């Protein structure tokens, strides 16, 4: 395998879940784990990142 | 998980993941590498080994 | 700013994100890669004190 490498798309089967913001919880994003408060963001992205 | 019991291979080993971890991470480009050996020469396939 | 900078250095584990770390391993192979990180952050803290 190779880790963090391009938007990975093939991982062992975990269900998703409704989307919360604007409150102090914990995230997981393709293996990226963490706690904060998310909103939405003025940045743009190029279609690649 | 399920490949980790379901044939109850005789060597099964991993290195930089743990083999009950493999069910929550996401990786990209997985390779698959086969070929058969003799006996003696399994513990030489390990990486950093001579 | 230099004190700062220090936490996106190795100091000799396999990754520099802790989270890293407590996901893709177990706690018996994770001890000494917690450990070093310590030690070098450890370091650094005491040299900005000082």
């Given at each position: 395998?190779?880790?963090?490498?391009?938007?990975?798309?093939?991982?062992?089967?975990?269900?998703?879940?409704?989307?919360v913001k604007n409150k102090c919880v914990?995230?997981?994003?393709?293996?990226?784990?963490?706690?904060?408060?998310?909103?939405?963001?003025?940045?743009?992205?190029?279609?690649?990142? | 998980?399920?490949?980790?019991?379901?044939?109850?291979?005789?060597?099964?080993?991993?290195?930089?993941?743990?083999?009950?971890?493999?069910?929550?991470?996401?990786?990209?480009?997985?390779?698959?590498?086969?070929?058969?050996?003799?006996?003696?020469?399994?513990?030489?396939?390990?990486?950093?080994?001579? | 700013?230099?004190?700062?900078?220090?936490?996106?250095?190795?100091?000799?584990?396999?990754?520099?994100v802790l989270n890293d770390i407590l996901?893709?391993?177990?706690?018996?192979?994770?001890?000494?890669?917690?450990?070093?990180?310590?030690?070098?952050?450890?370091?650094?803290?005491?040299?900005?004190?000082?």
């Amino acid at each position: 395998f190779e880790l963090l490498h391009a938007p990975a798309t093939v991982c062992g089967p975990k269900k998703s879940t409704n989307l919360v913001k604007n409150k102090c919880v914990n995230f997981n994003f393709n293996g990226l784990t963490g706690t904060g408060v998310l909103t939405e963001s003025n940045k743009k992205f190029l279609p690649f990142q | 998980s399920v490949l980790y019991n379901s044939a109850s291979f005789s060597t099964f080993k991993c290195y930089g993941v743990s083999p009950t971890k493999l069910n929550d991470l996401c990786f990209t480009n997985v390779y698959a590498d086969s070929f058969v050996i003799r006996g003696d020469e399994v513990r030489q396939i390990a990486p950093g080994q001579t | 700013n230099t004190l700062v900078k220090q936490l996106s250095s190795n100091f000799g584990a396999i990754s520099s994100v802790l989270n890293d770390i407590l996901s893709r391993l177990d706690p018996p192979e994770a001890e000494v890669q917690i450990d070093r990180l310590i030690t070098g952050r450890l370091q650094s803290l005491q040299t900005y004190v000082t």
